[PDB]
Design a protein around this motif. Sequence first.
Motif, PDB file in Angstrom:
ATOM      1  N   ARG A  26       4.068   1.755 -16.718  1.00 11.22           N
ATOM      2  CA  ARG A  26       4.896   0.575 -16.978  1.00 11.22           C
ATOM      3  C   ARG A  26       5.991   0.908 -17.979  1.00 11.22           C
ATOM      4  O   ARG A  26       7.143   0.499 -17.804  1.00 11.22           O
ATOM      5  N   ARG A  59       5.024   4.632  -3.093  1.00 16.95           N
ATOM      6  CA  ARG A  59       4.143   4.091  -4.127  1.00 16.95           C
ATOM      7  C   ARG A  59       3.738   2.639  -3.880  1.00 16.95           C
ATOM      8  O   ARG A  59       2.826   2.147  -4.561  1.00 16.95           O
ATOM      9  N   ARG A  93       0.808  -1.222   0.000  1.00 15.87           N
ATOM     10  CA  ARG A  93       0.000   0.000   0.000  1.00 15.87           C
ATOM     11  C   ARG A  93       0.838   1.267   0.000  1.00 15.87           C
ATOM     12  O   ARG A  93       0.278   2.353  -0.182  1.00 15.87           O
ATOM     13  N   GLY A  94       2.143   1.170   0.274  1.00 10.96           N
ATOM     14  CA  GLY A  94       2.968   2.361   0.427  1.00 10.96           C
ATOM     15  C   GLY A  94       3.159   2.785   1.868  1.00 10.96           C
ATOM     16  O   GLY A  94       3.745   3.843   2.116  1.00 10.96           O
ATOM     17  N   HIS A 130      -1.916   3.305 -16.266  1.00 12.76           N
ATOM     18  CA  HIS A 130      -1.185   2.087 -15.936  1.00 12.76           C
ATOM     19  C   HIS A 130      -0.166   1.712 -17.010  1.00 12.76           C
ATOM     20  O   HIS A 130       0.997   1.423 -16.701  1.00 12.76           O
ATOM     21  N   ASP A 131      -0.590   1.707 -18.281  1.00 14.18           N
ATOM     22  CA  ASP A 131       0.307   1.297 -19.364  1.00 14.18           C
ATOM     23  C   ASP A 131       1.488   2.255 -19.515  1.00 14.18           C
ATOM     24  O   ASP A 131       2.619   1.822 -19.771  1.00 14.18           O
TER      25      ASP A 131
END
Lengths: 445, 445, 445, 445
Positions: D337, D394, A394-395, D333-334
């Motif tokens: 990455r 994060r 979760r960080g 998200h992409d």
Amino acid sequence: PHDPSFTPTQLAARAAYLLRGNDLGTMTTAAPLLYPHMWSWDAAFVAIGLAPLSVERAVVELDTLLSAQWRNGMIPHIVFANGVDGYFPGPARWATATLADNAPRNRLTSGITQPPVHAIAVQRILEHARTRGRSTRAVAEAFLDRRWGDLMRWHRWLAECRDRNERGRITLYHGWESGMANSPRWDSAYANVVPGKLPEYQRADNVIITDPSQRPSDGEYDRYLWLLEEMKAVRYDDERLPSVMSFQVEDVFFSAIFSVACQVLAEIGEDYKRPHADVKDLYLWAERFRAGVVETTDQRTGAARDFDVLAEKWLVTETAAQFAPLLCGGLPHDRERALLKLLEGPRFCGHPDLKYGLIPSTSPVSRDFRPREYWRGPVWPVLTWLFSWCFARRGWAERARLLRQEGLRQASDGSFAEYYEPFTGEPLGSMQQSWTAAAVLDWLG
Amino acid sequence: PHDPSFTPTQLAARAAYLLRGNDLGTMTTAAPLLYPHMWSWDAAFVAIGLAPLSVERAVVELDTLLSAQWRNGMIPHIVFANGVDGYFPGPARWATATLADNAPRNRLTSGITQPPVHAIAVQRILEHARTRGRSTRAVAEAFLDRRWGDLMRWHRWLAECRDRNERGRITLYHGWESGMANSPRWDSAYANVVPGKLPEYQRADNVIITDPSQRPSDGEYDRYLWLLEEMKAVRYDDERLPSVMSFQVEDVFFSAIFSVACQVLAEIGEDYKRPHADVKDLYLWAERFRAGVVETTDQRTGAARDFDVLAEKWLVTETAAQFAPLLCGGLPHDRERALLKLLEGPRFCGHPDLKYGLIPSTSPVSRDFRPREYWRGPVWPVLTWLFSWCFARRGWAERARLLRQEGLRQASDGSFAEYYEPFTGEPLGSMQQSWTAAAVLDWLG
Amino acid sequence: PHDPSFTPTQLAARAAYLLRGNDLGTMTTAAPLLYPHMWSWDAAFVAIGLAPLSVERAVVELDTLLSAQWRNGMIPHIVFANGVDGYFPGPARWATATLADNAPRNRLTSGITQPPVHAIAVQRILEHARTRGRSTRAVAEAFLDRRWGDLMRWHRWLAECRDRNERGRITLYHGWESGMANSPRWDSAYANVVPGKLPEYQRADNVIITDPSQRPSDGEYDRYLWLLEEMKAVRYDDERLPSVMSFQVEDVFFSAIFSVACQVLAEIGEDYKRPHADVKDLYLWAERFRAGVVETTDQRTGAARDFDVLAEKWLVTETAAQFAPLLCGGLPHDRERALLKLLEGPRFCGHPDLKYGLIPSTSPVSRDFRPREYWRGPVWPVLTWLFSWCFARRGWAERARLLRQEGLRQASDGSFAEYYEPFTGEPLGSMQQSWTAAAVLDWLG
Amino acid sequence: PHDPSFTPTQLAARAAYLLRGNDLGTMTTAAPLLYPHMWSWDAAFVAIGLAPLSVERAVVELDTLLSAQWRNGMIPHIVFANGVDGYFPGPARWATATLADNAPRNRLTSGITQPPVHAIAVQRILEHARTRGRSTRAVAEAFLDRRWGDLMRWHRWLAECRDRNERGRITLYHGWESGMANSPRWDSAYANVVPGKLPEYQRADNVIITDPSQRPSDGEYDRYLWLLEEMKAVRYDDERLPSVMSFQVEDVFFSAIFSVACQVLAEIGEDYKRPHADVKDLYLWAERFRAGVVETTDQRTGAARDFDVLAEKWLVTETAAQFAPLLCGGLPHDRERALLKLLEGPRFCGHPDLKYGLIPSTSPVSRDFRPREYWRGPVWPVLTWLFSWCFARRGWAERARLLRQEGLRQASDGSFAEYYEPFTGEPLGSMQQSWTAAAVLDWLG
Ligand SMILES: O=C(O)[C@@H](CO)O[C@H]1O[C@H](CO)[C@@H](O)[C@H](O)[C@H]1O
Ligand SMILES: O=C(O)[C@@H](CO)O[C@H]1O[C@H](CO)[C@@H](O)[C@H](O)[C@H]1O
Ligand SMILES: O=C(O)[C@@H](CO)O[C@H]1O[C@H](CO)[C@@H](O)[C@H](O)[C@H]1O
Ligand SMILES: O=C(O)[C@@H](CO)O[C@H]1O[C@H](CO)[C@@H](O)[C@H](O)[C@H]1O
């Protein structure tokens, strides 16, 4: 002497010594005598503890577990060691070898499941393998080639057969499937389990753990064993279980673990170029079960509730399962802050009499609290590890670090106990418990 | 990656994992395949590595070794595992079971001995046990009650049967008894071993270690095996060996170890109220062998020499055995300073091309030096451990610490190699060698 | 909170942070407020603590101390910081600037001495420097070139002026020269000190440490300050002190330290090619003071006794000074075993109520014991360090390790206290005491 | 010698020794000689390094910085030590004391700002304080009471005066405000700075660092110093700077740091019951600057771009600033990455010639890369720390751990260098740089 605790190097050495000592060859027993077989979620944690010692042997552990997977995808919670006695209910009592059409031909197993932490073990294996160089990466990648399909079939069976109504929560037919046999979570559901003609039996667990304050009661085992009779009557058929089982609950903690596991396995699938449809399904299930967990939560405190499918009622109890939403995410900001206050406050980690800043299995202020009695109060190192790893994900780096620090302090006696008395720190349950050594091994780095 | 080394906790864990992996039940093999049986001085070092993990199992290791002790007190250098093949010369070649009247009925063994480090292992077991509390102290004290007599009979056999002339040096009848099969120390003695009709044989050691640069030559094995034929011809009779053996040397390093071991065992005897006559004998032998070692030394440099009993000549070579007097004490002040300068200077630990500040088995500047060839040059972790422990016992705390620090650096790859190339640090010999893991376990604390 | 102890890295960082915080530039105060100047044996321990941080600054510390050395070779026990008040007796009370012909022109100092641990600090500096490379070795070697003569003059002054009859024991003219102001050791000698017209004064020490149970009484200070008047009246003339001082004792602990320091300095002289005549004198004094210590010892226990030169009687007390012969060696084997039994038994380290297995300054079973009162009972980390280092130098590796382990446990609160309550572990005396931080840094640096 | 690296305890001790050595009393210099004053973002990292040593002194460091805050809320990037020369441009060149109506009356400061890492330091101080007990928590809570308003005014000045159009990016008027004086990021903007009659000056930085390959050129300094003339000519009036400054850029890395700092400070405000309106504003700014960072990003790689406000063009360079979105989140998200693939691949951390797996300030494959030249290539430990801490926040626990492991390996020489050569690991810039010691202490404290 003045200090019976071990140094970090001593403790790491003894934990690895234990793990290799509980190795039968291709499977590690959960404990030397109380649990002298392979258990499903224990095997995931054992693989995590083996990963710093031998990526090859960590992979073997998951291969052995998956070789016991049922034809429909279920991972059963016990894989019995050939010719080994001393655990009840054993293979003869389950009778899955003769009754369960989906049970594997070449392994004796139980007929119920357990939580899907396996993807987390795969992630830790891959993380170790990537620090070790090309031949070791190849071992872990070959495992993914060999077992990705089986892992998909495991997650699909959970999503499709234990969430038939697409509610985003996993239905259990036995409290043993929760991992927490005698948790107060299941008391009101178990109160409606009325055994009929139950065949005679002799317990083995309380011959090994003789202190009656540490294990469930005979009345509780009567109900545990009666559910076996109901399952056996329908030959462990998925399609018939909803019609016959006297115990049907939605387990919010198992559901949250499943959400996390789907997200983890989806990320693995992206990194290792697994089929797009699989990764898409895994992300869809991760989101569905995150939402299903959130739907159970108190709108004030964030505390997650289980659900009794037969009684059609939310199960409100004060156990560590309430913190399920912290594992998978999804809560609104204010609700998650309230849930963290509950975790850190005087009902759990902040209770003034706790020896360690750890999460008791049942709140010490609950009327159901019993400081020695298995899942009714003691502190379980396996839950410390699971919460700390999910919190780091979760960080919440400092929250995760504090749990690890306190878990290592608790474990520094070298007993590697199954669970610990929350106020005195007395080791309870089985000594030499494999997932307690694995937790220490993963933590020490 | 950028760094293939392990952290101290990782390395300790892997060392304990290895040791438990080489455990057959009541004996630990010296290595998984090259040495798939129990060796005598390896078993002492294994007990040292087990002591931080399980005082009970460390005691078991020495019990198993002593159960193979010959009727005259000799501890044979190999105790074979029942039904295990893969090592040559094996039980059939020694034929002690049919030829040696003193060999134990219930163990298959070799027919020669090895250095008496066993008392040092007993001291480390007792030291660990005293930090662990009463039940563990009782285990170690019960071992002393059970095995003190056997340890006395071992030291007495050395003092009376391998030092028949009371010279304070141990006579060997095989280079294998030194622990250093192909050491340059024995070359001139072996040059006078002329094999006769030697029965055919197939080596196994160089099927496992295929690199010919790492193991002795066929010509050397012919001589090793011929000495077996000489011993077998007289049925391993102590009284007849001096009349028939083509190899008879006084080993100053073995002698120095024996001096240390007698002093250590005498101190144990005082602390645990063993018979006064035994303690008196042990101190007398400690002094006799200290003096015997000193008598071999160069009056300028302090370097200790072996002695060829048949040729009646001092054996002058440039190996780590020269430092024998540093282990046991007794040198005059100026001579010991000169010997320490030799140790720390450019012929040994100070050689500018060494990767680690460690003691090569043969001086890199010697004409006999071979950087890969077993005892002709490589760095042996077992010797690092022995020198560091004896140096600490002399009071040389920083010298001992530096050897431990460099030995841990060398071992940080996790190969647990039998020996290491002195310039590159390449792991050589068998991997997964038990006494290399034991050295790491003892050091890490 | 649940555990207020620091990790080893946290503790090492805080220890170094403390030591730099007490640095005035070229001298380190012994504490922030109670001892806001340089003390002699503290400065040696400070140099040991600085050596892992900066060999250059460690050398500066000893250079500053030796720049205050008197013309006759005496190292005075205080070197006052210019313009600093807050300690009594201060420079005005000593009046060495106006009365002592041998006092240095460019430093204000006290007029008495303190124990000669300085050679031990030089050895630790050299050991660190040899691990750090050529530039750092040159710094340490340049210090030897610059200060070897001063160190010799210090040892020669002790041997010639404080052992005028060559008895091999050091005479003191003030209990402060022992380092142990209010030790029970000196009570009967102090009972024979009768002050005349003592000039009025106000203490400073018990304004900073206000708990009266932790410092000496006014009656004791009256006697401490009267001895200063006796020295001032003869202008600190060495030749006159035997005729006028009301306090004259042979300190066996100081003597044993001097024996060790002579042997240490002699070894340094050999290694660094110092003049042979100096090395020969150092070894002669090492032997003389070893014998002088042994001559005091109890025939049953080996315990060392101080001697009252004026009363002509052996001083028999139950303090840590009894263990002087363990530092320097020399006892017959049987009596040293008896002395170690006293050390480890219930009168000292094995007393059942001690929080840590450490040596109390006065035996808890003595009628003189006071658990808070400075040298009358409390555990001093500086003595733990000195005993541990001397024990390792005797070869007693495990005994030294246990003292270090318990000393680090005691110090892990990070108070860096001057001394600790033996039963509760409460920090006492000054906090942030430099030599307590130095002990920790050496044990971890 | 064989290995000149320090152990973790040695390294932690030396780091704390350094930090205390650079303490002038109430401020810590950024380095001993090159940077002999307080710098703003250095002071935040110094407070992080002090927190494991003294929460009280860590709080003092931030109090001293905030006592120099300008009347409009700006924290200036230098707080000059009274009476200290040796850095240029010094107070006389800035002339803020006579020209800047908002400068503080009781401190000499620069007239530009630096990145807002200060809230991260407050979080670390609070985390340490909560582990230390009631008195230490009170110290940290009292600092919040005293300085919360000042911290809000700092964040408000950034959001209102350096993001006047509410674009969610911070405008800078000097490359020094980015913290990265000579980053390739600013080359095209600096090409549009044309000095007028620039008053003569002499640099100080390249008298201390004489290697010309390690500092900016005179041509670069001419432009740095000309921007000061432009600010002085309008008396550092915020409202006038857009009309007169020849350098106006939106700094995406500064913006992402501000996003994180706002979220961190908002969480602190919730936990410590600060005014709700302040918390709401902090979360609004966190979101605004997150979005502002994401708007700059490359549609293929996710890399963040700076913006030249005067030229109206995106600044496309290959520096570590591209990874700004990883700090604050917000990318799809992409694309995140893809950005992590860039980070870990052969253009940055996976470049095959790097000695350590760390992030170079400029990509080694960029035409702009210079391996020695300050921000044009070298690895900066302060950026390693900031990325590792943000990555842990994060949830990327293993990525953060690997950066910390490699950062500690690089720092284990104990040089505490300002930056390091990426291929050889040679220490560059100033040695004994405070924030490099602080990174080490946090990673170990
Ligand atoms: O009590 C039992 O017989 C079994 C029933 O499966 O359950 C206990 O032991 C298992 C193996 O350690 C764990 O997997 C469970 O979590 C724990 O509750
Ligand atoms: O080469 C061999 O076959 C045997 C012969 O005994 O010797 C080697 O292996 C033994 C077991 O590890 C060691 O005890 C020896 O020291 C080492 O030289
Ligand atoms: O009490 C005092 O005023 C002084 C008198 O010299 O003595 C104490 O402080 C010194 C500095 O720490 C130590 O050197 C002593 O050992 C300790 O007893
Ligand atoms: O070069 C300079 O004179 C200054 C200008 O502010 O900049 C350097 O030193 C500062 C103090 O260490 C750091 O804050 C900067 O990041 C670094 O680039």
